[PDB]
Design a binder for this molecule. Structure first.
Ligand code: PLM
Length: 393
């Protein structure tokens, strides 16, 4: 059996009936606690009554604290409405709403510098409620239950700038929220136009995804447009993605439904940086330097770092190798001075050649003494399975 309405084993039916009795006290506060609704929670925890109940009660508490009942009427900040990419557009062959995620032109720094992380997360919650509401409308129009969504995840333009830690963490917060509050809602997710950086980028959010979500992700190759047309009718897919749908004015991208992001104009900023902490701190003497070592053995790794200096700029460069002078080592990222005391510095480097990498903070050119440098560095690894897919497609 599949644990779905109309296909329950006697044990699952008994569990469903018991589950309803056990959570009776919170059902009135729910929009429509039918059997489909309850079974999403049971399936998400393999019909373990205790875990399923804990999951649903936590969701109920979440709805209360986030005022989900009124979130659709809540209007997100102007900068978010204008620049947060993505959009609901069309229905798949089964009648399920399709959601488009446009990663490339998303300006995470711009959004985080112009709005609170709370409003960003709330906007995402709202999109989820808008999608569920669309499912409810499709259920009425099609005369049958529609409760899942199809996602087209456009990774064209995915680059190193998207690995910026604060953005990834915020996104991770959304994903955990989605996994805990909208179980059994994702039907299928098509990753299209995934670039070379995909395996590393995916490995960053993979920890936030449930096994059920991971199994629904399909990384598509060169024939992605044809694959989409096997699940979605051509008139329901924008011209931009291989279909025939366009905006009334003839735009192939259907911008009336899909937001394509873009960099946020400086006039919207309310800050030039987000609050930041570092895992390490060193005091560098005048005319001296400090070396930080990381062994990179696996190819395809990416070094990601963030650092700030106190009161004065500092030099920074990355080398490949015991304490050697910069000149004795191989220069991978040319040493340069950064005003990391004015604006926090962050960066990434793709590590092609394995070896011992040395990030070197340089103060050899200065008399300013005891410069305090705060930094955080990580070696980002590629998701093995994803690496293999990139070789196939
Ligand atoms: C419903 C959401 C499912 C999640 C699907 C994730 C598919 C892989 C996404 C990799 C994204 C790369 C990281 C981008 C981080 C950012 O937003 O800046």
């Amino acid at each position: 059996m599949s644990g779905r309405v109309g296909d329950l084993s006697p044990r699952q039916k008994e569990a469903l009936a018991k589950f309803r009795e056990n959570v009776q006290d919170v059902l009135p506060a729910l929009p429509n606690p039918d059997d489909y609704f309850l079974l999403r929670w049971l399936r998400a925890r393999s019909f373990d009554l205790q875990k399923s109940e804990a999951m649903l009660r936590k969701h109920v508490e979440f709805r209360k604290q986030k005022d989900i009942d009124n979130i659709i009427s809540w209007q997100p900040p102007e900068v978010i409405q204008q620049y947060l990419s993505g959009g609901m557009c069309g229905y798949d062959l089964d009648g399920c709403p399709v959601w488009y995620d446009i990663i490339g032109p998303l300006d995470a720094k711009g959004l985080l510098f112009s709005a609170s992380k709370q409003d960003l997360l709330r906007t995402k919650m709202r999109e989820c409620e808008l999608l569920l509401q669309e499912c409810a409308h499709q259920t009425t129009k099609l005369g049958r239950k529609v409760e899942t969504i199809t996602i087209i995840y456009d990774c064209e333009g995915l680059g190193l700038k998207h690995l910026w830690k604060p953005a990834v963490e915020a996104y991770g917060e959304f994903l955990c929220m989605f996994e805990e509050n909208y179980p059994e809602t994702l039907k299928r997710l098509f990753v299209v136009k995934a670039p070379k950086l995909f395996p590393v980028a995916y490995n960053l959010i993979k920890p936030f995804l449930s096994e059920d979500t991971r199994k629904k992700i399909m990384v598509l190759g060169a024939n992605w447009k044809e694959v989409l047309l096997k699940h979605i009718s051509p008139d329901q897919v924008p011209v931009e993605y291989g279909g025939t749908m366009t905006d009334p004015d003839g735009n192939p991208k259907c911008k009336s439904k899909i937001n394509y992001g873009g960099d946020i104009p400086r006039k919207y900023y309310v800050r030039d940086q987000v609050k930041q902490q570092y895992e390490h701190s060193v005091q560098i003497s005048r005319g001296s330097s400090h070396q930080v070592e990381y062994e990179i053995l696996f190819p395809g790794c990416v070094l990601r770092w963030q650092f700030m200096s106190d009161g004065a700029d500092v030099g920074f460069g990355i080398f490949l190798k015991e304490r050697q002078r910069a000149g004795e080592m191989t220069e991978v990222l040319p040493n340069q001075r950064y005003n990391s005391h004015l604006v926090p510095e962050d960066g990434t480097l793709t590590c092609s050649d394995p070896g011992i990498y040395v990030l070197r903070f340089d103060n050899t050119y200065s008399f300013i003494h005891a410069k305090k440098v705060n930094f955080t560095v990580e070696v980002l690894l590629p998701d093995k399975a994803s690496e293999e897919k990139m070789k196939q497609l």
